[PDB]
């Protein structure tokens, strides 16, 4: 934000060597306060009247309390402050004249001053006692009732104790002062005048110079960021939709700091938040049953799927049950079912949460049962007294969608083995991503290795050796029988979390069972709200897929943290066949990048496998072979573009030698685009390719001499029979 | 176990460089089918694969003889992915390009003291088109090319 703009560089130094002289007198901070408030200063040549490019109809003269003394003859001005939004101070100069009667340049200070008052200290935090009591210097503190310079028509009211009883009414008048005080303290002439008349405003202004100006130039610099930020609801305001159990989130807070790495989580269902604290273990990869959000079972994985969200989905349920069975079938000993035993607190919880209604009681087989009501319309429920088991049956006037009908049975839930004990299951902590600091990964590499790497004489090979190191010990992710797909640190990290939520009190085992959704290449999910725990310990919850993205770019991507994103982004994940978008820098630059031999041949193969017709068909038309022979020609130029011997050249040549090779390709493309019946599909492609090349070559030009436009440059070339001198021509064109 | 799509390429390419349009390629011809595909066997590493099957007139593979040749070195490799993530890591600003400024930067947090000289130097040797920066492509090359 370059604060000052010099319009006309017309007069010799005189004009300039005047504006400078003007500003070099105003404190660097007083300027920083300006720029900070977003202001800009305008020094222009002869533009007295409403003539400046910013001197037209907006907030102009509304009420008339103008200069030091009030005047308002506008047209007779040379200095002005565009009062309303960002402060726009505009000043113009003419001949060699401010020093003789500095009584003129002083307005450049007050005219300015109205810059910082009303947003300085006089009122910027509020009329903070500092200025509120300093203002009291009317006639109560010092024996200096010499405020006749700033308090005339508006404060000859010496007969009125000026504290909070009256200062508000005229915030404005107390500016006319801070200004003149400013104009005086800095006026090239009368500085002492301020020090000899009002004795405090001098010290006030002085402290301001002392550092008082760097003050606001910070409480504003700081509120510079905090203001315009990324709206995420931080703190427990987030920890609420987070889902995670607070004692845990906190437990986590430690790791984040120690290891220095952002921890991100997807939404953890609220209806399981407590089943967790309670001690219910969490769902691993082994189980694929659907949770539930209603009735007693809510927040558990009902072995009976008609008792979960997909209640009614005669096919989801039909395939849902089908999944708990296999879950058990396949992983016996570790996965099976047990009776739903809602405990104490849970009941009162699903109560004020309106999931279940505890009422009328009843008797059966000699045991007590408190009927557990639920506005469901096919299943009735009741919980025991002896043990809190829960049961249900098909109402006498309904049926199960699968076509089942039964009497009081217990509600069984899925449960994993945990210390030789089938504990019931609920939602887990599905990490969305883990972003360790680059420095952290550095401490993941075994010194000797990183050493054997750096202790090399090959400048470029070193870089490589490192990158691989960084790749091996940091970006690589392997598969796993147990924890899904993840990295190694990812795993050591995955532990520290559970052990962290263990020395807390959890007795359900683990709460984080697998790798980050960033490896959910299979069935990627898109959650609007993402909970994140920075390396500092603060809680955060984004609101959009975009904000999360934006957030990650500002705090992780371009700060010093390692982060990779789901390989299936911007592609079409097979499993759920979903397209989830995520900003990719490489793609950003694609438009301006000539394609590669392979990237080219690829896009051909592609289309072939779509409009079954290929660039060239296996036939005899000597026109076909023309085409074949001709793409083989492109798949050569493009290949030549990216030559690794291009190093024995200089930057200057590279662009040239390349821009040419580039043009070469572009040519043979125009050549085939002007061929026989090349399917219109390929036609479009080549049209696409052309543009790249174009963009590329342009970019390569702009790096050098730039009055040349690909279009022109191309014309001037001749790719008829002799390509030879053509290149010598080319060079000549770029001089 | 190459995918079908993974196959179409290996043909589109394998054919394009089949001059005498039959369905078999010479040795030099193989060298080129792959080079173009963005790979590159060594002058001698080029034989041991083709050389390994000699039923076509000793020194010429068919379409399968080739397709089935895309296992030895392929039913293992997947680095092409990491390398692209390595790249997004050094491109600290999101421009799709890696500047010497950011090389030096990431290069040091990882704990390497690089001389302001020896950076503008790496960047240079990785730059092929001469625009001073290294793009995913130039990068991909510098990495894999051995
Ligand atoms: Ca042949
Ligand atoms: Ca043979
Ligand atoms: Ca960059
Ligand atoms: Ca480049
Ligand atoms: Mg999970």
Curated annotation (Swiss-Prot), chain A:
The active site is at 288 (proton acceptor). Residues 427-559 are annotated as: Catalytic CA2. Mg(2+) binds at residues 428, 430, 514. Residues 1-210 form the ATLF-like domain. GO terms for biological process: cAMP biosynthetic process; symbiont-mediated cAMP intoxication of host cell; symbiont-mediated perturbation of host signal transduction pathway. It is found in: Secreted; Host cytoplasm, Host cytosol. Changing residue 290 to M/R/A: Loss of activity. It catalyses: ATP = 3',5'-cyclic AMP + diphosphate. It comes from the Bacteria. Changing residue 576 to A: Decreases catalysis rate. PROSITE patterns: ATLF (PS51995). Changing residue 430 to N: Great decrease in activity. Its main location: secreted. Changing residue 463 to A: Little effect on activation by calmodulin. CDD domains: M34_PABD. Keywords: ATP-binding, Calcium, Calmodulin-binding, cAMP biosynthesis, Host cytoplasm, Lyase, Magnesium, Metal-binding, Nucleotide-binding, Plasmid, Secreted, Signal, Toxin, Virulence. Changing residue 283 to Q: Loss of activity due to inability to bind the substrate. Host calmodulin is an absolute requirement for its activation. Inhibited by ethyl 5-aminopyrazolo[1,5-a]quinazoline-3-carboxylate. The N-terminal region contains the ATLF domain responsible for binding to the cleaved form of protective antigen (PA-63). The C-terminal region contains the calmodulin-dependent activation domain and the catalytic site. This region is composed of three globular domains: CA, CB and a helical domain connected to CA by a linker. The active site lies at the interface of CA and CB. The metal ion is coordinated by residues from CA; calmodulin probably binds in a multistep fashion first to residues in CA and then to residues present in the linker and the helical domain. Belongs to the adenylyl cyclase class-2 family. This is Calmodulin-sensitive adenylate cyclase. It comes from Bacillus anthracis. The gene is cya.
From Swiss-Prot, chain B:
(Microbial infection) Inactivated by S.flexneri OspC1 and OspC3 proteins, which specifically bind the apo-form of calmodulin, thereby preventing calcium-binding and activity. Pfam families: EF-hand_7. The modification Phosphothreonine is found at residues 42, 108. GO terms for biological process: autophagosome membrane docking; calcineurin-mediated signaling; cellular response to interferon-beta; cellular response to type II interferon; detection of calcium ion; G protein-coupled receptor signaling pathway; G2/M transition of mitotic cell cycle; long-term synaptic potentiation. There is a cross-link at residue 19 (Glycyl lysine isopeptide (Lys-Gly) (interchain with G-Cter in ubiquitin)). GO terms for molecular function: adenylate cyclase activator activity; calcium channel inhibitor activity; calcium channel regulator activity; calcium ion binding; calcium-dependent protein binding; protein kinase binding; protein phosphatase activator activity; protein serine/threonine kinase activator activity. Keywords: Acetylation, Calcium, Cell projection, Cilium, Cytoplasm, Cytoskeleton, Disease variant, Flagellum, Host-virus interaction, Isopeptide bond, Long QT syndrome, Metal-binding, Methylation, Phosphoprotein, Repeat, Ubl conjugation. InterPro entries: CALM/Myosin/TropC-like, EF-hand-dom_pair, EF_Hand_1_Ca_BS, EF_hand_dom. The modification N6-acetyllysine is found at residues 19, 92. CDD domains: EFh. Ca(2+) 2 binds at residues 54, 56, 58, 60, 65. The modification Phosphoserine is found at residues 79, 99. Residues 5-40, 41-76, 78-113, 114-146 form the EF-hand domain. There is a cross-link at residue 19 (Glycyl lysine isopeptide (Lys-Gly) (interchain with G-Cter in SUMO2)). Homotetramer. Interacts with MYO1C, MYO5A and RRAD. Interacts with MYO10. Interacts with CEP97, CCP110, TTN/titin and SRY. Interacts with USP6; the interaction is calcium dependent. Interacts with CDK5RAP2. Interacts with SCN5A. Interacts with RYR1. Interacts with FCHO1. Interacts with MIP in a 1:2 stoichiometry; the interaction with the cytoplasmic domains from two MIP subunits promotes MIP water channel closure. Interacts with ORAI1; this may play a role in the regulation of ORAI1-mediated calcium transport. Interacts with IQCF1. Interacts with SYT7. (Microbial infection) Interacts with Rubella virus protease/methyltransferase p150. PANTHER family: CALMODULIN LIKE 3, MYOSIN LIGHT CHAIN 1, 3. It is linked to Ventricular tachycardia, catecholaminergic polymorphic, 4: An arrhythmogenic disorder characterized by stress-induced, bidirectional ventricular tachycardia that may degenerate into cardiac arrest and cause sudden death. Patients present with recurrent syncope, seizures, or sudden death after physical activity or emotional stress. CPVT4 inheritance is autosomal dominant. This is Calmodulin-1.
């Amino acid at each position: 934000n370059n604060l000052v703009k010099t319009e006309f560089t017309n007069e010799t130094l005189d004009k300039i060597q005047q504006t400078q002289d003007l500003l070099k007198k105003i404190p660097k901070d007083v300027l920083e306060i300006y720029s900070e408030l977003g202001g800009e200063i305008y020094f222009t040549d002869i533009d007295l009247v409403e003539h400046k490019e910013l001197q037209d109809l907006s907030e102009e003269e509304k009420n008339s309390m103008n200069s030091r003394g009030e005047k308002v003859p506008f047209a007779s001005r040379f200095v002005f402050e565009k009062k309303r939004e960002t402060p726009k101070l505009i000043i113009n100069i003419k001949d060699y004249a401010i020093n003789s009667e500095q009584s003129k340049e002083v307005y450049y200070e007050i005219g300015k001053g109205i810059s910082l008052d009303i947003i300085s200290k006089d009122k910027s935090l509020d009329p903070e006692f500092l200025n509120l009591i300093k203002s009291l210097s009317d006639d109560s503190d010092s024996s200096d009732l010499l405020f006749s310079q700033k308090f005339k028509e508006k404060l000859e009211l010496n007969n009125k104790s000026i504290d909070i009883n009256f200062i508000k009414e005229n915030l404005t008048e107390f500016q006319h002062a801070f200004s003149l005080a400013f104009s005086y303290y800095f006026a090239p002439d009368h500085r002492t005048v301020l020090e000899l008349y009002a004795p405090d405003m001098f010290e006030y202004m002085n402290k301001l110079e002392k550092g008082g100006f760097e003050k606001i130039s910070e409480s504003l610099k700081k509120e510079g960021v905090e203001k315009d930020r990324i709206d995420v609801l931080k703190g427990e305001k987030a920890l609420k939709a987070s889902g995670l159990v607070p004692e845990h989130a906190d437990a986590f807070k430690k790791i984040a700091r120690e290891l220095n790495t952002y921890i991100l989580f997807r939404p953890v269902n609220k209806l399981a938040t407590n089943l967790i604290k309670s001690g219910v273990a969490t769902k691993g990869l082994n189980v694929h049953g659907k949770s539930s959000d209603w009735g007693p079972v809510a927040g558990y994985i009902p072995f009976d799927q008609d008792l979960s969200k997909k209640h009614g989905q005669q096919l989801a349920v039909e395939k849902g049950n089908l999944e708990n069975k296999k879950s058990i079938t396949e992983h016996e000993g570790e996965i099976g079912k047990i009776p739903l035993k809602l405990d104490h607190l849970r009941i009162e919880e699903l109560k004020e949460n309106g999931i279940i209604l505890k009422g009328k009681k009843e008797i059966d087989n000699g045991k007590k049962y408190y009927l557990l009501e639920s506005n469901n319309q096919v299943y009735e429920f009741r919980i025991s007294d002896e043990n809190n088991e829960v049961q249900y049956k098909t109402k006498e006037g309904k049926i199960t969608v699968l076509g089942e009908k039964f009497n009081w049975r217990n509600i069984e839930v899925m449960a994993k083995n945990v210390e030789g004990v089938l504990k019931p299951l609920t939602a887990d902590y599905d990490l969305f991503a883990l972003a360790p600091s680059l420095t952290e990964i550095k401490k993941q590499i075994p010194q000797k290795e990183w050493d054997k790497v750096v202790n090399t004489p090959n400048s470029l090979e070193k870089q490589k050796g490192v990158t691989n190191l960084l790749i091996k010990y940091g970006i690589e992710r392997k598969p796993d029988s147990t924890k899904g797909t993840l990295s190694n640190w990812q795993k050591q990290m995955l532990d520290r979390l559970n052990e962290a939520v263990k020395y807390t009190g959890y007795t359900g085992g683990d709460v984080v069972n697998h790798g980050t959704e960033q490896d959910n290449e299979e069935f990627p999910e898109k959650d609007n709200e993402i909970f994140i725990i920075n390396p500092e310990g603060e809680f955060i919850l984004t609101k959009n897929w975009e904000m999360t993205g934006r957030f990650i770019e500002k705090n992780i991507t371009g700060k010093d943290y390692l982060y990779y994103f789901n390989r299936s982004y911007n592609k079409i994940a097979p499993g759920n066949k979903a397209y989830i978008e995520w900003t990719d820098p490489i793609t950003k630059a694609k438009i301006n990048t000539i394609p590669t031999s392979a990237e080219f041949i690829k896009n051909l193969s592609s289309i072939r496998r779509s409009s079954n017709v290929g660039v060239y068909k296996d036939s005899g038309d000597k026109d076909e072979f023309a085409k074949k022979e001709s793409v083989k020609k492109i798949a050569g130029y493009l290949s030549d573009y990216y030559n690794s011997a291009n190093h024995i050249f200089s930057q200057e040549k590279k662009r040239k030698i390349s821009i040419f090779r580039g043009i070469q390709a572009y040519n043979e493309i125009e050549n085939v685009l002007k061929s026989k019946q090349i399917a219109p599909e390929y036609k479009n492609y080549f049209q696409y390719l052309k543009e790249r090349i174009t963009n590329q070559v342009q970019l390569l030009l702009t790096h050098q001499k730039s009055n040349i436009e690909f279009k022109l440059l191309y014309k001037q070339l001749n790719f008829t029979e002799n390509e030879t001198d053509n290149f010598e021509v080319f060079q000549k064109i770029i001089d | 176990q190459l995918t079908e799509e993974q196959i179409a390429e290996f043909k589109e390419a394998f054919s394009l460089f089949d001059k005498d349009g039959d369905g078999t390629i010479t040795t030099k011809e193989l060298g080129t089918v792959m080079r173009s595909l963005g790979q590159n066997p060594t002058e001698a590493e080029l034989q041991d694969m083709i050389n390994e099957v000699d039923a076509d007139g000793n020194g010429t593979i068919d379409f399968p003889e080739f397709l089935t040749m895309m296992a030895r070195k392929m039913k293992d490799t997947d680095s092409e992915e990491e390398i692209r993530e390595a790249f997004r890591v050094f491109d600290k600003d999101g421009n799709g390009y890696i500047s010497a400024a950011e090389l030096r930067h990431v290069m040091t947090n990882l704990g390497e003291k690089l001389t302001d000289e020896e950076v503008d130097q790496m960047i240079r040797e990785a730059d092929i088109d001469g625009d001073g920066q290294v793009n995913y492509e130039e990068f991909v090359q510098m990495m894999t090319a051995k």
